[PDB]
Subunit: 488 residues, 4 copies
Amino acid sequence: AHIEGRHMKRMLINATQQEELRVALVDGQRLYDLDIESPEQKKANIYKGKITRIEAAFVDYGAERHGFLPLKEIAREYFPRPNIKDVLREGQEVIVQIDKEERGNKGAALTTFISLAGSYLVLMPNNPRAGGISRRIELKEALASLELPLIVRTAGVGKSAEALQWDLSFRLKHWEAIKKAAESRPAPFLIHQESNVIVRAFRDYLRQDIGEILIDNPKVLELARQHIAALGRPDFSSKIKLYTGEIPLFSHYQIESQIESAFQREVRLPSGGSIVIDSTEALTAIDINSARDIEETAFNTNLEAADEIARQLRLRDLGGLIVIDFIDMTPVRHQRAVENRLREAVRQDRARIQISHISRFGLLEMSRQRLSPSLGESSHHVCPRCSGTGTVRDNESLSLSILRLIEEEALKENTQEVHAIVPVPIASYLLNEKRSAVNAIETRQDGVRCVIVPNDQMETPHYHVLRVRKGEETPTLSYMLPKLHEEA
Amino acid sequence: AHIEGRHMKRMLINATQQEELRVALVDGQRLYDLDIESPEQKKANIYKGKITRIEAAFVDYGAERHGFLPLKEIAREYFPRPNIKDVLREGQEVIVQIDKEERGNKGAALTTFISLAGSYLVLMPNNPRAGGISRRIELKEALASLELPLIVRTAGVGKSAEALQWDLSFRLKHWEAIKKAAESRPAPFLIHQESNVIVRAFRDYLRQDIGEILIDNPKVLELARQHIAALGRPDFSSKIKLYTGEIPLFSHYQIESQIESAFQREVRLPSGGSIVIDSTEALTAIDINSARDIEETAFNTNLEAADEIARQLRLRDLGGLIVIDFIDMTPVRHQRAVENRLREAVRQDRARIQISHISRFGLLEMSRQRLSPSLGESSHHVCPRCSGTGTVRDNESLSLSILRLIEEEALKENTQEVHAIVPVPIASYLLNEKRSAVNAIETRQDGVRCVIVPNDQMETPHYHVLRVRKGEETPTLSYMLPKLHEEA
Amino acid sequence: AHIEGRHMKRMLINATQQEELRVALVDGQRLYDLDIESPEQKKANIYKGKITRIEAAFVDYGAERHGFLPLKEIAREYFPRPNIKDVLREGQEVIVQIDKEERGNKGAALTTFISLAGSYLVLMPNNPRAGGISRRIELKEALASLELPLIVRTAGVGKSAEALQWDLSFRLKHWEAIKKAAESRPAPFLIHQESNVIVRAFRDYLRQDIGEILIDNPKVLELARQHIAALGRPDFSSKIKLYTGEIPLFSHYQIESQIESAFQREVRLPSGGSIVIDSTEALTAIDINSARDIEETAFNTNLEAADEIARQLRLRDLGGLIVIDFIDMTPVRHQRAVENRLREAVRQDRARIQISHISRFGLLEMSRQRLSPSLGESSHHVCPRCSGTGTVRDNESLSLSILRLIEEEALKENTQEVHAIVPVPIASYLLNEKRSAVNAIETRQDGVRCVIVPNDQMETPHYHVLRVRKGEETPTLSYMLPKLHEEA
Amino acid sequence: AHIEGRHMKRMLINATQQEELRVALVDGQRLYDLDIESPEQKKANIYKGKITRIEAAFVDYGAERHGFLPLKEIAREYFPRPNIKDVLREGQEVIVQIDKEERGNKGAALTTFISLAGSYLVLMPNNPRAGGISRRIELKEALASLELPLIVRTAGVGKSAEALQWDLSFRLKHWEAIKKAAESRPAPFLIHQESNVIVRAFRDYLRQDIGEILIDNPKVLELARQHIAALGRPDFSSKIKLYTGEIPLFSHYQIESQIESAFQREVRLPSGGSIVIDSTEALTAIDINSARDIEETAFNTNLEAADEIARQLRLRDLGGLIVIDFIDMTPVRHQRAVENRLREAVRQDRARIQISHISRFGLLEMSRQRLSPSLGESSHHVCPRCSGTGTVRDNESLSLSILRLIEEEALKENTQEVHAIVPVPIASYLLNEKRSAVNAIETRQDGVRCVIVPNDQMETPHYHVLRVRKGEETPTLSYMLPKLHEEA
RNA sequence: UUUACAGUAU
RNA sequence: UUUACAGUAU
RNA sequence: UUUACAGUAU
RNA sequence: UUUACAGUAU
Ligand SMILES: [Mg+2]
Ligand SMILES: [Mg+2]
Ligand SMILES: [Mg+2]
Ligand SMILES: [Mg+2]
Ligand SMILES: [Mg+2]
Ligand SMILES: [Mg+2]
Ligand SMILES: [Zn+2]
Ligand SMILES: [Zn+2]
């Protein structure tokens, strides 16, 4: 029955566990955004940067891996439709910010347009081209009055001009202090570290509609206060209240299950059905099942599914392409209701999203900007049994596979023996079910020994086949082979 | 450099392994379709069928699980835009064929329109509505001449009218024999079993362009011959030749690697880049990476990628929705080249496909009809570490997770102890890194014992938390707990 | 340099661990006897006893297992060189004490001569035949003065006659209370439970030379006091002192290593060499090695070895036969020095010992009475790898063994298959090194399948061979066999 | 019912398995001696030997380990009651034979008295002091007639003087060839390798009472013949017969179970009871249990037990001291019957034995000369769970043990953390049952972290405790510790 | 294997 | 496999 | 623990 | 976060 406005919106900060600081936005008991931080974020850090290798170009900002820099992102003041081999010389030093953190193998997006975020404004020092209103918001007037050689945040709504000036200045101080520690050293160095998860919250998530800001630990709270004030949000001060229940905070507000759902592949919807979220090389793919009038059911579920998808998108910090497979509905009107629901349900999201109509296949494609790395990238690792595939090849299939591999290697001229080192049950199978087979191979391709040793240090999909050439063979024992061959 | 026509197209039948009979269509050494059969296929089997429960309706054709029957698929002669609660009464007997085998939880598609496949025709006894030309093909004339109260196959091209009559008859005999063993027994029984993999090949894949039909085993070959003749394909007889190389057949024709590619998640393309195939609840998703002029590269790779996708679609018997993420190309002309390539490259496919333009997201959606079950369904099983997800949740994350679960259970009124039974390293972590935590819980929620026993019979994601109520507790030993609790 | 008398003898009671109460007699820092008790001793308990089955006779004193009763141990008053089939009728009730606890399979020694231990006397109510002096000790006179229709303890030395009377009485009270709860119920019941480890100490180990009695816990201490007083040892009261060091008691007195030595197979001697204690079905066997004048060395070491053996005998509570293999010495005089040393070194032992001369083989046999069960019986369990033997049969030996077993079973008429289920490396070996072998068997003894499945749930010595008769065979998978056969 | 003489005595040679050549002496179907050889024996090999270090003295005869040489065993001709520092100078070369192979840590007995074994004589070239009759046997006369500057075997009984001369010569040839390849090279070299297991048999075990010599393989048989002839035993030739049953040789003669008994700890006796053989640092110890007139039973069993012990002594090649614990018998006459039985039953044994009367403890000590290494030394290895002890310390005991160790290490000044790395269930126990304990330690001995990580790469008795000093600590994870510490 | 050697010592 | 069918629904 | 008991026997 | 940016490229 969720209607925005009915209940309070609190920001719950849970800081009783050293190893995972947690910030929830909750509306009533509905978790609608989560942020965790563990002893950490590198986005928005600024660096003195030396160009590595134009081939836009790559960079050494000090990290184990160089960063990526787009021609689009080079500056006017840093430029001594042209080719980059023109504006920037190798080894050339330049001020650099991180737009996108390191994902998989990519370095990072860096930009020489540098942006500075405060409570109410965002200085764009390195560019006048971009600046103006929060597409979300008397201020066009208050804006002009300001000095400069920038943008106003969704949070200036309830404030005057001095405050913007108060902000605008502090920003500048930074900018100055910024290009000063830049004119004062070698090139490959960190200049500015982004604020931590609590600051960021206070800076970026404090709409006027945030009722309270609860906190489960005193030390932090205190830290919290100083953070507000220093942050120019004096008003909120009264709002920060220390929680002291025996029952844990996120638990009292009944949001831990919801936090967990961020981690499941399936997520149950209100009326019963569910969504399954599956990630893949290319894209994330969400699918949708009904629970128990048909046409109705399909509609209603898809509607729930939209709302949920919208928040899962956020909790799991999901970025890039996303392909949703809504239940199929005949009435075109339904198809629009549903896309609309979706658009509606993602309006609060801070990330740029782009949605799109249900295809004739019943698929809906969308895209959501990478704000930060996702759950799965940052709190999961690739299942090391299957190596991402989520399946394991049945035993025979694999065995017969291996058998063939064995004969092939047996065929090569100059072969003395072949050692197949393999999961136990494979060995069982090759050495019973397929005994004759292996025999045949051995009688046929002649004086070639086929060793197939079982090995409990292996599970099925993994195995090795080695080929031992006439000459190189030893008097080793079958079961001693795995260790002998441990260097491979 | 593959140009259709250059080289011979042989059908390689590999039957030297009892447990996996293998039929390859190869063009030169290019594998372009594979069929494996293991001591098996249920599609096209016919049954006497008793209606279970109208709610189209479900069926008992004898299998552990009832089958699905669409109103669309009920007959005129079996009907004693209306509702099914009208045409078919519960328990009612009716002739039934399988359109689609059992997938996951679904029963099967059954149809009371029954189709009978021979070399040149397909009798549609139970319906005159559908019949006519192979959209792939003097015969419109040869067709009419026939008796009846049906369709002509892509293979009638090189034959006369008597042969169609010769076929047409044999079909009818069957039809008769069909509804006779149907009028002669109870209802829940198998009537017709589909032919095996070799017959099916000969029946369905012998275009005039098939040069030879090689075979690696004598017994089968002989069987093969009788299969041709009985199949009314006398011409091919001369074409069936027994292979006798020491080197295995599929190996001599260098197609085993290609057969294997059907099983990898990544598949390298000619010029270097690759495609990654990822399956998911909803759909399969193929992604495409370049290897090393940009615009060129992207184009050329996407082109290779199309060809490959087309054959992988076939080797892996992939069905349903498929979403391809081609490398992104600016020139719209390229986007059409690529979709076209794809269409071209899938023309030979026997399954109905539907393709579609590259979306503004760079995605291409397509659909390919389920002919049979896919590799992954039929020769893989769900990785039992991760349970499909392809990831495992990092240790702390999981632990902290468990910790919270523990406190929560500790809170419930009437609790005496809580036993967390968990992977070893979780236990390590909860009992060192998080010792104080667990302590706190215990001192706080009072005289409540928190047992956290490590267990080597578990890997990380799996765990148990049990709650032992005041009264129900025992004097068991920490490490004895897992077994005590083995009934859960 | 240990001379008895030099340093204090304290009794250290260590009771800071709920699960193991520990009482050490230490002389200086030399541990010279240890007693542990864990939440326990059954010796000296008294029972109402019903005769089970004359065949002396067995008994039901209530325990899961009946007890053993010697004709020698039946009474005059309980007797309604004769045969027991005479004195005691089946089911006959009689008062019963435990002389020896349950060892391995034996029930227990029970006696109808019942003995009652107090600080200074031992009432022998059920017999006047035995009574008199502690062979270890004015009292022959003090003894007579007493009433009666009994023995004086080694501890009466420093006391008068009233105290013996004070003791003598309390004893009698018990005796009376004893045969009263005996005349007041069915037969199969416990009558008297022996005191706990602390009481027993105070009762049985408090010679006048015990300086202090330290204790590491207050609650127990207090309990301790009441135990002394109730025990009629008022004098010692001043002697009981509570220990309060941060450093653990047994640790401060540097005796924990020595306590541990009770648990090693090897035990280093002062001058360097060592003794190895090995227990066996029959007897314990101690062996003795020198460390680095020969004749000297041998002598001196054997001498150390004697002292040590004497205390190990005690710490490990070793009973029954013991065979020591001293280093060999030519000079007969040495052989006597050494036996004597031994006799000397075991004089303090409370158990009856019998020693004996070094045999011509250099062996010394001795015997030491079972006071209680030994370390190894009470804090060890039979190594479950080797099953007592302390060796594992090398792999080939075992394999070849199994191979032969396999052929044999293959030979039996009416055999269809033989399944060898075996440790992995055995399987490796049988299925590579011995492949031809297994082959031969199979080609020879005909159409008989030899399945040899590796199994990681087994280590080498354990294995199974099953024989599957014509008829009883299944289509199971090689590696599925272990589970199929798990009922055996 | 075994009476020597009733049945044939055959020598069964089983040589159908490359990896274990087997020679059985069987009387009827009673195995009464076994010899196995695997692709091997070093006793009786001769070497050129360089003295390493007088301290008799040690030697380098080429083996990884030097050999032991007794003053008693130096020669007259090699001597340039005195001290060895006199007769033999360091580095001095001398002819050397192996009396006793390498056992455990000992090198080997070597002797400069060299003995040469043929069918009928034994040349003692390097000494005239020793020579004469087989204490087991017209020949005193035949002996004298011989030339020389030696002993007659138990096998000369049925032969003349020429044969002794024929032998005597061949021996000499060897002797000459011996000291020639000795005068013709450096010092550290092998001179003579002892014959293999089949030769040795034929040479040493062919009494006239050996009926047949069966053989299960043709190639070997043939080899066998040439071995006889070359061995001067022409008579036996007719006796060597090739076995050709499908049923394996040792199996047909029903002796495989008996061969196996050589490997069990328990061995059932005819009438039911059994003997348990237990080996130990010092000595082997045999114990004896009855099965179901008492006095009778005890006697009869002990008698069986004697016979069995006698043959087990042989099958298991048992050497050194042996202590038998016969069932106890009152009648002294019985005690002599039994010792006598034993003496009788070991008369055939080739090794020197010395027996002795039953002690007052009921123990019988005996000694049997090491002919070769024993089963357990040569086909077993030390159980690696328990490390010889045959027991494992119960869990708590071990844990509490570890706990104490932990506190102790916590106490040392300059300690930052202590890591206990331990079998899983220990960790369970220390971290539940003993949680407070570990807590206490930590609160008490202050800011000292006690890490106790469970580890599945360990079983209970093994564990590690490390102490990490202020300074040397890291930010490693609890469960990452075992690997971090894997270098220890 | 013979007034011996067997145990035993490295 | 033919104004079809392919996806889709259990 | 005392002309004893200790080993030993189930 | 403002005719933008979001996807996308390493
Ligand atoms: Mg769906
Ligand atoms: Mg996946
Ligand atoms: Mg891509
Ligand atoms: Mg010794
Ligand atoms: Mg042992
Ligand atoms: Mg015994
Ligand atoms: Zn997985
Ligand atoms: Zn063991």
